[PDB]
Design a protein around this ligand. Structure first.
Ligand code: NIL
Ligand code: CL
Length: 333
């Protein structure tokens, strides 16, 4: 541990941090804290065994590099990165520091029935951040209420945290083509998840709360309708097909009858997100232009990202090389 760092234990895990970070409190391996250098509250994450294996080392580097890369008002912002390591020989831990927001979307839904205007503003920001992420060539793949952080004024940022305890199941928000093991899914998977999130903000409860895999699929088909064989063929592996074929056929339901009393514009947009055929899902960029967001839409203030270049992290290297590369990335921040 460096000079100017101090150590404490937070629920049987040791944290070693610089003096500038005070009052660590599990959120939570994420803590809230006050950063005395930045003069603001922050979140701090202690990565879990970052160099345990090649895949952990690759994901450690990627998380650091990706957060360096993504600078957008609706995506969690990297503010600092540190290690208690004094040199490469004892480099074993990586800590990331980001914006801290007031709460997550689950908290919001649990405490309040959201006005239509608040739903507009929240989904607008979610899509604006998503436009930026997708323009970078990045797929989120785990959008769900616990990965969306919001302030009392409804400002929103996308994050990615990475079972019996406020647990929110990925299963409830996951595109059916991911569930059915389609090997060539693309960024539209995130639009499915946004449709699930928006539905939940509108109704105050999850739209497809499956108790298991089969129950998840049954709930989805009951609303969107059983796909044709042709569409089933492009959203599933050969083996996963049978799970769908064995269900009795279900017609598509009118979303107006599910979301009785919602803004008809909200219903219209939902029907362009919650579809099985990806060709027919609205992009994040197009969705921002929808009349549901006419209060907020501003084409000059919905920016693109530079493409995230995967070339370095994709190259084969040893665990020792990964440590050296990542150490340099940490020190350069
Ligand atoms: C290998 C890999 C990683 N990622 C990825 C990681 C993150 N990381 C964080 O969101 C993250 C990292 C460190 C910290 C400290 C935080 N902060 C955090 N974590 C959990 C909860 C909260 C929180 C909750 C409520 C209010 N405010 C903050 N903040 C996030 C974010 C992304 C995203 F969304 F941008 F694409 C992608 C993708 N592939
Ligand atoms: Cl630093």
């Amino acid at each position: 541990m460096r000079a100017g760092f101090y150590r404490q234990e937070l629920n049987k895990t040791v944290w070693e941090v610089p003096q500038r970070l005070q009052g660590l409190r599990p959120v939570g391996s994420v803590c809230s804290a006050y950063d005395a250098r930045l003069r603001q509250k922050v979140a701090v994450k202690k990565l879990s065994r970052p160099f345990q294996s090649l895949i952990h080392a690759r994901r450690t580097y990627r998380e650091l590099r990706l957060l360096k890369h993504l600078k957008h008002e609706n995506v969690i912002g990297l503010l600092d990165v540190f290690t208690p390591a004094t040199s490469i020989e004892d480099f074993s831990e990586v800590y990331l520091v980001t914006t801290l927001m007031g709460a997550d979307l689950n908290n919001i839904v649990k405490c309040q029935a959201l006005s239509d205007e608040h739903v507009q503003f929240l989904v607008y920001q979610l899509l604006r951040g998503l436009k930026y992420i997708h323009s970078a060539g990045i797929i989120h793949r785990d959008l769900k209420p616990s990965n969306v952080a919001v302030n009392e004024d409804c400002e929103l940022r996308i994050l990615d945290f990475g079972e019996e305890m406020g647990y929110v199941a990925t299963r409830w928000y996951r595109a059916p083509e991911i569930m059915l093991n389609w090997m060539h899914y693309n960024q539209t998977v995130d639009i499915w998840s946004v449709g699930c999130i928006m539905a939940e903000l509108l109704q105050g409860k999850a739209l497809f709360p499956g108790s298991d895999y089969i129950d998840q699929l049954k709930r989805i088909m009951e609303v969107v309708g059983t796909p044709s064989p042709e569409v089933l063929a492009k959203i599933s592996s050969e083996h996963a097909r049978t799970y769908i074929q064995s269900l009795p056929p279900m017609p598509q339901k009118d979303l107006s009858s599910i979301f009785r009393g919602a803004n008809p514009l909200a219903i219209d947009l939902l029907g362009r997100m919650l579809v099985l055929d990806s060709d027919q899902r609205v992009s994040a960029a197009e969705a921002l232009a929808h009349a549901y967001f006419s209060q907020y839409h501003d084409p000059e203030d919905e920016p693109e990202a530079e493409p995230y270049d995967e070339s370095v992290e994709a190259k084969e290297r040893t665990l020792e090389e990964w440590k050296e590369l990542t150490y340099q990335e940490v020190l350069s921040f």
